[PDB]
Amino acid sequence: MRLGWIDPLPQVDTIFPLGLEPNVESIPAGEVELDFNLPETIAKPFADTVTSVGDRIQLVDDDKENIATSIYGLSFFKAARQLYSTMLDHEKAVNQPLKAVYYDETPIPAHMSGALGIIGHMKTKVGDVLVKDAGVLFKRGTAAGVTKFSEIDNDKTWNLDCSKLVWADHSSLSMIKRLASEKISQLVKQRYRVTDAQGHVYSVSMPQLTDQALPDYYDSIPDVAPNSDQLRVLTAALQMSLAQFRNDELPHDEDRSDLLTTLDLLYADGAYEISALRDQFELLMARYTTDFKWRVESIFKVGPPPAGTTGYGAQTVSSTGNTARWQFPLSDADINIGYLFSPSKSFSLFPKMVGYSKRAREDASASFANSDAKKFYA
Amino acid sequence: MRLGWIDPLPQVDTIFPLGLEPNVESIPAGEVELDFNLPETIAKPFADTVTSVGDRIQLVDDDKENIATSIYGLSFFKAARQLYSTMLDHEKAVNQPLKAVYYDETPIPAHMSGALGIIGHMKTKVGDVLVKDAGVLFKRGTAAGVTKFSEIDNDKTWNLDCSKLVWADHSSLSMIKRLASEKISQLVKQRYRVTDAQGHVYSVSMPQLTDQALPDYYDSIPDVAPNSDQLRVLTAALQMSLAQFRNDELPHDEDRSDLLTTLDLLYADGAYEISALRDQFELLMARYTTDFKWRVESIFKVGPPPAGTTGYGAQTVSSTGNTARWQFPLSDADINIGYLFSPSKSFSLFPKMVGYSKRAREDASASFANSDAKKFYAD
Amino acid sequence: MRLGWIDPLPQVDTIFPLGLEPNVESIPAGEVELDFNLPETIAKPFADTVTSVGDRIQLVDDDKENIATSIYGLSFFKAARQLYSTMLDHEKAVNQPLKAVYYDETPIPAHMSGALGIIGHMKTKVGDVLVKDAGVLFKRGTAAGVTKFSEIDNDKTWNLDCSKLVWADHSSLSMIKRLASEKISQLVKQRYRVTDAQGHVYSVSMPQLTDQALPDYYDSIPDVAPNSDQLRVLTAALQMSLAQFRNDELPHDEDRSDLLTTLDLLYADGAYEISALRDQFELLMARYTTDFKWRVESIFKVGPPPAGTTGYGAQTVSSTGNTARWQFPLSDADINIGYLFSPSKSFSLFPKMVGYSKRAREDASASFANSDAKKFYAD
Amino acid sequence: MRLGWIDPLPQVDTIFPLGLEPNVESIPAGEVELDFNLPETIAKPFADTVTSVGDRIQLVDDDKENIATSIYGLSFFKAARQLYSTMLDHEKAVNQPLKAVYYDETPIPAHMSGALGIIGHMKTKVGDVLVKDAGVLFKRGTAAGVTKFSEIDNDKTWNLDCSKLVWADHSSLSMIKRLASEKISQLVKQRYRVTDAQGHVYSVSMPQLTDQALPDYYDSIPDVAPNSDQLRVLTAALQMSLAQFRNDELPHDEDRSDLLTTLDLLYADGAYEISALRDQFELLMARYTTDFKWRVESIFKVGPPPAGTTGYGAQTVSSTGNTARWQFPLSDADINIGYLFSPSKSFSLFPKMVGYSKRAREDASASFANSDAKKFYA
């Protein structure tokens, strides 16, 4: 049955079979932007007990700290697994290389596993609600685990803020492009005075990038306008081709260095390059098995990592102090797990349905109405 | 009981004793803007059909028109009744003067009634979704019926475009100011190239009403800027009080005739002034009862005018060609009726819930984690 | 089910369909500060009574003392167990290192147990009322038992005033900073007359830490001001991070030895350092089991150590002379026990509820008024 | 029975009959500060319908407006009645003169009457919770009604902000004195630099009025200190005698004019003088009976004015937008009426109980303990 959100019209009769069946037009019908730190927020409680209980057992110093570190790292690695598991067909295709992350079934504290299960795209009564930028996130979540594990050995090869990383694939590109538009319509709100011979000092702002073509918009940018340089870069970025972005040959000869530094991003290359992560992951996993698995599993009741098909309402909650906040009706456990880990940054539902009709409205109505005509009697 | 919009999470209750109960943080939950002509879109089929059935009692061509004209006006009046019937208690209150429109129960064609029954505020499993500017609409809907009826005799006293009327009350003022803000930001999108002692062509544009003080924003408007006049009026309107709106004393010595002529509205006064509308309504109704009721009821199967407490999903449907579009899941009845009369201009659902826990997150988290605790450190 | 604290209002339900449900807006609902010596106040009667019953098994004078001394220490350890048993999950968590104190079930005199059973956080029909600085208390209570037991042999390793100990954790730091603020505003009440080039005697005083920035407040401290030094240390403490507190790197190059010597606290380190306390506890307990348990249990009727989940009203009672004082209604048991051991230093109940309506006040009001409506204008 | 707020101790036995029965020590055990406008907030809805419905009936212009005005005026007059009805014995004594306000039983819209019923002192399971400054409020509420009614004739004899009025009785005095202390510890928080030969510019504030005697505190006030003059006045006020205040002969020769203007108060005299209000009330009432009673009663279903013995929990609620806020558990109707009229400015509960014992604690405890002694057997 359909969503019983509102009451159904008391079957206003007549109307021949127009054939208006429902069809989703909005693909996706909604998005959720998960908080990059969700996996950290989740591991926290466990990693913590590893520090408190540690001393009573003979787990101390460097060791106590590595065991705790592992939990954060596995938390990221396992959260990646989940997300990938719920990705669209092509999304999995594109991330083919890191599929080893998805396959690994290293156990984790049971409830930590349960919590990670809320992550992922959702099938819902109004359409598909997706995890915005899954591709980027899946890769960031992975880099994060490799990075966290690196702390064990202080190995600074993997030493970057993984939240900022962006690769040279399409998933990252769209994000770059979006974040660009964001900035422009953000900077353009600024004012600057133009003291002219004809009429003293004015007060105007950089024109909003409405219907004007990207090229022209670029030129039409006055060095005097606040953040002139940035507008240039970002506009240029709106023009880039995945290839251009990948080779620092940004249109209007701008620098990727600036584009990225403007959007406070980082270019994943060298160590954080897809391939490199794959290998490093495999090592970290083989290392974890021998060296830390036994402790971790002797401290907690562990269970298999999640690897479901859908995420859950919980991904829609936000927390602060003792209050939770959501938009559409959630179950109780959804609201609870939601309040514990405050998984979302933003959430948008925006369904759109469509129906087709055999006949046009005029005749359809003319008939609807005609039912009230009285029969000429005698 | 909660909207089964998505699949629920299967979980262990260590957490469960928290207290997080859902509370409606913001009111209302949604909003629907109705197409002003909805009453006409519905009346139309019936009005037209009169050319046929009018013969059952041999109506002359002239009379057939008046009967039809009545069905249009009648539609408006009954649609108003419905809307008013669903209004929040404050709105029913302020609109007390025209309550006769709500009280009157003149029968209308049966199906004509059914269709009208879809309009008005609607309570949903997500909260209340209101008809945008219901108060203004209710009066416009009323004025429209008074005008349609004023066609039976070429009486030009009531001869305006009711779809533009605004009165001297808060419901209207509030809408005025909103249309002002929208209009502004629409104009601030234009570009005029001011050539200075500096450089040459400077394709620039007027600042956006971001964080300025209304008074200041007014001053800082470059006489040169495209549609610089409008920006002045409109900015002024955003300031004007209800009081000033009546007396044409728009802050920066601006004319209301401009404010209205800009937003394309008419100042409902004189003839279209509430109390005048009341009397006019009471009369036209009396006339209808003595000159047409019998004819109309001898032609069509009539029924009681809608006057329920909720609107329906149908109000959220839009039609164009042979396609119909909505947003949230609707029943078939709603889709069909909705398709026939394409009743909505816009529709937004923006529910906001909030809950409080009796436990700090740090503690609740602690417990959640202690679930996987082993004997050597569990309680 | 709600606290029948006051008589309910008798009313007509036109209003009732609003949704205003009570939600706990702020946590916790109350707070109780316990007198540190509560364990001693309770042990005392039993310890003393040993001079009598000790004869049942002919204990030499020396042994009688050790037995008594044990009853004091034992009291502390068991009071800690209780408090810990009632702590919020986060506190039980962070205090994991000393959980052996909670685990141990050494029997104590029956009534001695009952009395101790009153301590700890308490859930009430108003919310949770917490034991102020429970975390710090739990460790101090623990250190105290370790110290009392260290008297059996003149072992001076543990010979401090546990009632002043503070550790390098948040629970302590948080308390430190609070005692700092209080101390400041206590000093800022003094008056020193600075004679200027202007006028003569200017009975003045140091500014109150109202809206200044901590750094600035520090600078602006007049070398002349009474207890000007303390104000410096204390202001610094209000800044210092947990990190800095460990390493004696107090912001404005201040000494922790002063901060502590000012607030009259001791830095729990070395001997009184958590892990050291654990080992020490485990040992003294083992010793008690082999050298006194039998004697103690041959003298008194013993029972299991308290370890429930809630404290009781008694914790909110204060005694002086033959008068006993409390605030909110207590049972007799609570008043009596409370009177015997005057367990509280302070007690505050500050519940805060919040509710949301699904109706704007203006509408709800409208309805409320429409109740007295007459026919000519009612729906 | 006692308040079942928390769980009772599991009867820890022994303890001879110490005789510790409970006794309230705090009289009052709590206070509520009602919002001066409560009666206006209440009449609003009714006065409003008098304006909307007015036109359909032949009620218009001056008339429509007077009927509406009446409702506000009666609202104040009836709210005064209620409050007086619940005042302590002496409180009624002191306001003896305005007892006519209490006796008048003019009907009012039924539910408007019901709402006013929440006003007044409360008897509660922890003691007596009083309406702070009832005497002052009762008189203000009365003046307010006389003032509102004056609008009918534009008669500006009664043309003052009644919220500020203070009379020369004790009730008002205590208030003045309290509001003084408030201001001092408020102004004293301010700083001012004292540039000295010995050590450049300092930074100090007016000393808090702690244990110093009022007289000395007065003198010790430097003209340089921010708001020097006010501190003087207010300190002087803390010293006034009801008599001094009544004759403008404030200690340290200060002016009542300033004391009042500092505390943004007004001296009720001349027209707003107790006696004068009494007479005017009587006229307003006789006028209302003839001239407006019939309309008012033909628009609403009316009922007798409230005149109860206690106020109610509702007086404890605060409203804003769609949220209500209270402290201690209230019924549902209490929370509801509370949200509709947001009656309180502040609310404080602060019980204090006392018990006496036949024996001192030492022996009492020595015995409690002695029950665990084992009997020397064979």
PDB file of C-alpha atoms in Angstrom, chain A residues 183-346:
ATOM      1  CA  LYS A 183      31.176  29.671  -2.382  1.00  0.00           C
ATOM      2  CA  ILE A 184      30.347  31.976  -5.288  1.00  0.00           C
ATOM      3  CA  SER A 185      26.765  32.758  -4.219  1.00  0.00           C
ATOM      4  CA  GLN A 186      28.357  33.167  -0.792  1.00  0.00           C
ATOM      5  CA  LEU A 187      31.161  35.597  -1.680  1.00  0.00           C
ATOM      6  CA  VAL A 188      28.959  37.537  -4.114  1.00  0.00           C
ATOM      7  CA  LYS A 189      26.896  38.692  -1.130  1.00  0.00           C
ATOM      8  CA  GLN A 190      29.754  41.030  -0.229  1.00  0.00           C
ATOM      9  CA  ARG A 191      29.777  44.749  -1.019  1.00  0.00           C
ATOM     10  CA  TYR A 192      32.458  47.257  -2.113  1.00  0.00           C
ATOM     11  CA  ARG A 193      32.239  51.002  -2.918  1.00  0.00           C
ATOM     12  CA  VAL A 194      32.909  52.339  -6.427  1.00  0.00           C
ATOM     13  CA  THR A 195      33.754  56.085  -6.057  1.00  0.00           C
ATOM     14  CA  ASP A 196      32.888  57.559  -9.505  1.00  0.00           C
ATOM     15  CA  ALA A 197      33.339  61.045 -11.021  1.00  0.00           C
ATOM     16  CA  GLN A 198      29.634  60.908 -11.951  1.00  0.00           C
ATOM     17  CA  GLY A 199      27.934  60.460  -8.562  1.00  0.00           C
ATOM     18  CA  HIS A 200      30.207  60.011  -5.518  1.00  0.00           C
ATOM     19  CA  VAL A 201      30.961  56.662  -3.834  1.00  0.00           C
ATOM     20  CA  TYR A 202      28.369  53.992  -4.761  1.00  0.00           C
ATOM     21  CA  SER A 203      27.862  50.585  -3.178  1.00  0.00           C
ATOM     22  CA  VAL A 204      27.539  47.468  -5.285  1.00  0.00           C
ATOM     23  CA  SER A 205      28.379  43.749  -5.330  1.00  0.00           C
ATOM     24  CA  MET A 206      29.715  41.127  -7.685  1.00  0.00           C
ATOM     25  CA  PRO A 207      26.782  40.037  -9.877  1.00  0.00           C
ATOM     26  CA  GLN A 208      25.200  36.701  -9.001  1.00  0.00           C
ATOM     27  CA  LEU A 209      26.132  33.983 -11.473  1.00  0.00           C
ATOM     28  CA  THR A 210      22.648  33.717 -12.947  1.00  0.00           C
ATOM     29  CA  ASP A 211      22.199  33.074 -16.674  1.00  0.00           C
ATOM     30  CA  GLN A 212      25.585  34.393 -17.783  1.00  0.00           C
ATOM     31  CA  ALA A 213      28.020  31.924 -19.425  1.00  0.00           C
ATOM     32  CA  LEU A 214      30.905  30.701 -17.291  1.00  0.00           C
ATOM     33  CA  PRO A 215      33.598  32.132 -19.613  1.00  0.00           C
ATOM     34  CA  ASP A 216      32.200  35.673 -19.572  1.00  0.00           C
ATOM     35  CA  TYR A 217      31.449  35.496 -15.869  1.00  0.00           C
ATOM     36  CA  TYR A 218      35.174  34.839 -15.355  1.00  0.00           C
ATOM     37  CA  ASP A 219      36.313  37.911 -17.274  1.00  0.00           C
ATOM     38  CA  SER A 220      33.622  40.186 -15.804  1.00  0.00           C
ATOM     39  CA  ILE A 221      35.299  39.853 -12.416  1.00  0.00           C
ATOM     40  CA  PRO A 222      36.808  43.168 -11.169  1.00  0.00           C
ATOM     41  CA  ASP A 223      40.001  42.858  -9.125  1.00  0.00           C
ATOM     42  CA  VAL A 224      38.460  45.404  -6.780  1.00  0.00           C
ATOM     43  CA  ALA A 225      35.533  43.126  -5.816  1.00  0.00           C
ATOM     44  CA  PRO A 226      36.140  41.401  -2.444  1.00  0.00           C
ATOM     45  CA  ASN A 227      37.755  37.968  -2.950  1.00  0.00           C
ATOM     46  CA  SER A 228      38.313  38.636  -6.633  1.00  0.00           C
ATOM     47  CA  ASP A 229      40.912  35.899  -6.998  1.00  0.00           C
ATOM     48  CA  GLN A 230      38.772  33.213  -5.433  1.00  0.00           C
ATOM     49  CA  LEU A 231      35.750  33.975  -7.620  1.00  0.00           C
ATOM     50  CA  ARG A 232      38.089  33.466 -10.574  1.00  0.00           C
ATOM     51  CA  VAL A 233      39.349  30.064  -9.398  1.00  0.00           C
ATOM     52  CA  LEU A 234      35.935  28.739  -8.396  1.00  0.00           C
ATOM     53  CA  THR A 235      34.350  29.892 -11.673  1.00  0.00           C
ATOM     54  CA  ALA A 236      37.167  28.169 -13.510  1.00  0.00           C
ATOM     55  CA  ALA A 237      36.461  25.063 -11.449  1.00  0.00           C
ATOM     56  CA  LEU A 238      32.819  25.117 -12.560  1.00  0.00           C
ATOM     57  CA  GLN A 239      34.317  24.721 -16.049  1.00  0.00           C
ATOM     58  CA  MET A 240      36.986  22.025 -15.403  1.00  0.00           C
ATOM     59  CA  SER A 241      36.818  18.610 -17.043  1.00  0.00           C
ATOM     60  CA  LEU A 242      37.731  15.619 -14.883  1.00  0.00           C
ATOM     61  CA  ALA A 243      40.872  15.449 -17.017  1.00  0.00           C
ATOM     62  CA  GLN A 244      41.778  19.110 -16.494  1.00  0.00           C
ATOM     63  CA  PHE A 245      41.331  18.786 -12.722  1.00  0.00           C
ATOM     64  CA  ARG A 246      43.524  15.694 -12.712  1.00  0.00           C
ATOM     65  CA  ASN A 247      46.375  17.535 -14.502  1.00  0.00           C
ATOM     66  CA  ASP A 248      46.255  20.981 -12.862  1.00  0.00           C
ATOM     67  CA  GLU A 249      45.382  22.525 -16.240  1.00  0.00           C
ATOM     68  CA  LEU A 250      42.363  24.453 -15.008  1.00  0.00           C
ATOM     69  CA  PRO A 251      40.573  26.667 -17.550  1.00  0.00           C
ATOM     70  CA  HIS A 252      41.605  30.342 -17.521  1.00  0.00           C
ATOM     71  CA  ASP A 253      44.941  29.047 -16.289  1.00  0.00           C
ATOM     72  CA  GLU A 254      44.029  28.805 -12.602  1.00  0.00           C
ATOM     73  CA  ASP A 255      45.828  26.661 -10.020  1.00  0.00           C
ATOM     74  CA  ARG A 256      44.374  23.527  -8.498  1.00  0.00           C
ATOM     75  CA  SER A 257      46.461  24.538  -5.499  1.00  0.00           C
ATOM     76  CA  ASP A 258      44.181  27.531  -4.983  1.00  0.00           C
ATOM     77  CA  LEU A 259      40.931  25.819  -5.956  1.00  0.00           C
ATOM     78  CA  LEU A 260      41.640  23.236  -3.261  1.00  0.00           C
ATOM     79  CA  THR A 261      42.990  25.661  -0.701  1.00  0.00           C
ATOM     80  CA  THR A 262      39.971  27.907  -1.295  1.00  0.00           C
ATOM     81  CA  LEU A 263      37.577  25.033  -0.592  1.00  0.00           C
ATOM     82  CA  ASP A 264      39.805  23.816   2.210  1.00  0.00           C
ATOM     83  CA  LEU A 265      40.241  20.429   0.487  1.00  0.00           C
ATOM     84  CA  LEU A 266      43.278  18.195  -0.110  1.00  0.00           C
ATOM     85  CA  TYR A 267      44.286  16.302  -3.221  1.00  0.00           C
ATOM     86  CA  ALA A 268      44.523  12.605  -2.486  1.00  0.00           C
ATOM     87  CA  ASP A 269      47.623  11.452  -4.342  1.00  0.00           C
ATOM     88  CA  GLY A 270      50.944   9.844  -3.559  1.00  0.00           C
ATOM     89  CA  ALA A 271      50.219   7.913  -0.362  1.00  0.00           C
ATOM     90  CA  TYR A 272      46.443   8.524  -0.269  1.00  0.00           C
ATOM     91  CA  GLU A 273      46.155   7.403  -3.887  1.00  0.00           C
ATOM     92  CA  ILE A 274      43.445   4.656  -4.254  1.00  0.00           C
ATOM     93  CA  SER A 275      45.865   1.901  -5.199  1.00  0.00           C
ATOM     94  CA  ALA A 276      48.295   2.682  -2.344  1.00  0.00           C
ATOM     95  CA  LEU A 277      45.494   2.538   0.226  1.00  0.00           C
ATOM     96  CA  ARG A 278      44.461  -0.884  -1.070  1.00  0.00           C
ATOM     97  CA  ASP A 279      47.894  -2.376  -0.362  1.00  0.00           C
ATOM     98  CA  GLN A 280      48.350  -0.623   2.946  1.00  0.00           C
ATOM     99  CA  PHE A 281      44.909  -1.846   4.033  1.00  0.00           C
ATOM    100  CA  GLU A 282      45.873  -5.421   3.310  1.00  0.00           C
ATOM    101  CA  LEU A 283      48.978  -5.009   5.444  1.00  0.00           C
ATOM    102  CA  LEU A 284      47.199  -3.295   8.282  1.00  0.00           C
ATOM    103  CA  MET A 285      44.689  -6.126   8.296  1.00  0.00           C
ATOM    104  CA  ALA A 286      47.309  -8.883   8.354  1.00  0.00           C
ATOM    105  CA  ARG A 287      49.127  -6.976  11.078  1.00  0.00           C
ATOM    106  CA  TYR A 288      45.958  -6.462  13.157  1.00  0.00           C
ATOM    107  CA  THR A 289      45.147 -10.192  12.980  1.00  0.00           C
ATOM    108  CA  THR A 290      48.396 -11.281  14.589  1.00  0.00           C
ATOM    109  CA  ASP A 291      49.220  -8.405  16.871  1.00  0.00           C
ATOM    110  CA  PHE A 292      46.013  -6.881  18.210  1.00  0.00           C
ATOM    111  CA  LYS A 293      43.074  -9.150  17.393  1.00  0.00           C
ATOM    112  CA  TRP A 294      43.537 -11.258  20.529  1.00  0.00           C
ATOM    113  CA  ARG A 295      43.456  -8.331  22.986  1.00  0.00           C
ATOM    114  CA  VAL A 296      40.558  -6.574  21.272  1.00  0.00           C
ATOM    115  CA  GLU A 297      38.557  -9.803  21.319  1.00  0.00           C
ATOM    116  CA  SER A 298      39.381 -10.560  24.957  1.00  0.00           C
ATOM    117  CA  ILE A 299      38.056  -7.191  26.096  1.00  0.00           C
ATOM    118  CA  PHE A 300      34.784  -7.229  24.165  1.00  0.00           C
ATOM    119  CA  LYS A 301      32.081  -9.626  23.089  1.00  0.00           C
ATOM    120  CA  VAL A 302      32.565  -9.295  19.377  1.00  0.00           C
ATOM    121  CA  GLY A 303      30.377  -9.990  16.384  1.00  0.00           C
ATOM    122  CA  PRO A 304      30.528  -9.910  12.558  1.00  0.00           C
ATOM    123  CA  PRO A 305      30.778  -6.484  10.892  1.00  0.00           C
ATOM    124  CA  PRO A 306      27.577  -5.135   9.386  1.00  0.00           C
ATOM    125  CA  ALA A 307      27.069  -5.427   5.640  1.00  0.00           C
ATOM    126  CA  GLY A 308      23.385  -4.696   5.080  1.00  0.00           C
ATOM    127  CA  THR A 309      21.387  -3.448   2.096  1.00  0.00           C
ATOM    128  CA  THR A 310      19.892  -0.305   3.587  1.00  0.00           C
ATOM    129  CA  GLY A 311      20.703   2.375   6.110  1.00  0.00           C
ATOM    130  CA  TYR A 312      18.129   3.585   8.628  1.00  0.00           C
ATOM    131  CA  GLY A 313      16.104   6.469   9.934  1.00  0.00           C
ATOM    132  CA  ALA A 314      18.679   7.000  12.692  1.00  0.00           C
ATOM    133  CA  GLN A 315      21.012   8.578  10.093  1.00  0.00           C
ATOM    134  CA  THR A 316      18.529  11.476  10.220  1.00  0.00           C
ATOM    135  CA  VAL A 317      19.024  12.541  13.845  1.00  0.00           C
ATOM    136  CA  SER A 318      21.123  15.391  15.325  1.00  0.00           C
ATOM    137  CA  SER A 319      22.251  15.701  18.916  1.00  0.00           C
ATOM    138  CA  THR A 320      23.390  18.377  21.338  1.00  0.00           C
ATOM    139  CA  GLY A 321      23.548  17.998  25.082  1.00  0.00           C
ATOM    140  CA  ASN A 322      20.373  16.120  25.954  1.00  0.00           C
ATOM    141  CA  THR A 323      18.267  16.906  22.888  1.00  0.00           C
ATOM    142  CA  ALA A 324      17.781  15.024  19.636  1.00  0.00           C
ATOM    143  CA  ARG A 325      16.255  16.533  16.539  1.00  0.00           C
ATOM    144  CA  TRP A 326      14.788  14.963  13.397  1.00  0.00           C
ATOM    145  CA  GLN A 327      12.265  15.735  10.661  1.00  0.00           C
ATOM    146  CA  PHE A 328      10.129  12.831   9.539  1.00  0.00           C
ATOM    147  CA  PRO A 329       8.696  10.162  11.902  1.00  0.00           C
ATOM    148  CA  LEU A 330      11.282   7.686  13.170  1.00  0.00           C
ATOM    149  CA  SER A 331      10.906   4.518  15.216  1.00  0.00           C
ATOM    150  CA  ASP A 332      12.117   4.589  18.800  1.00  0.00           C
ATOM    151  CA  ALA A 333      15.379   2.730  18.337  1.00  0.00           C
ATOM    152  CA  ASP A 334      16.022   4.941  15.306  1.00  0.00           C
ATOM    153  CA  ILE A 335      15.602   8.068  17.482  1.00  0.00           C
ATOM    154  CA  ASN A 336      17.702   6.510  20.254  1.00  0.00           C
ATOM    155  CA  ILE A 337      20.707   5.319  18.286  1.00  0.00           C
ATOM    156  CA  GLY A 338      20.336   8.627  16.509  1.00  0.00           C
ATOM    157  CA  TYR A 339      20.682  10.652  19.710  1.00  0.00           C
ATOM    158  CA  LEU A 340      23.713   8.634  20.792  1.00  0.00           C
ATOM    159  CA  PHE A 341      25.803   9.258  17.694  1.00  0.00           C
ATOM    160  CA  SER A 342      24.275  12.326  16.019  1.00  0.00           C
ATOM    161  CA  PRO A 343      24.949  10.902  12.524  1.00  0.00           C
ATOM    162  CA  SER A 344      23.618  13.639  10.250  1.00  0.00           C
ATOM    163  CA  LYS A 345      24.858  17.019   9.074  1.00  0.00           C
ATOM    164  CA  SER A 346      21.765  17.632   6.935  1.00  0.00           C
TER     165      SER A 346
END
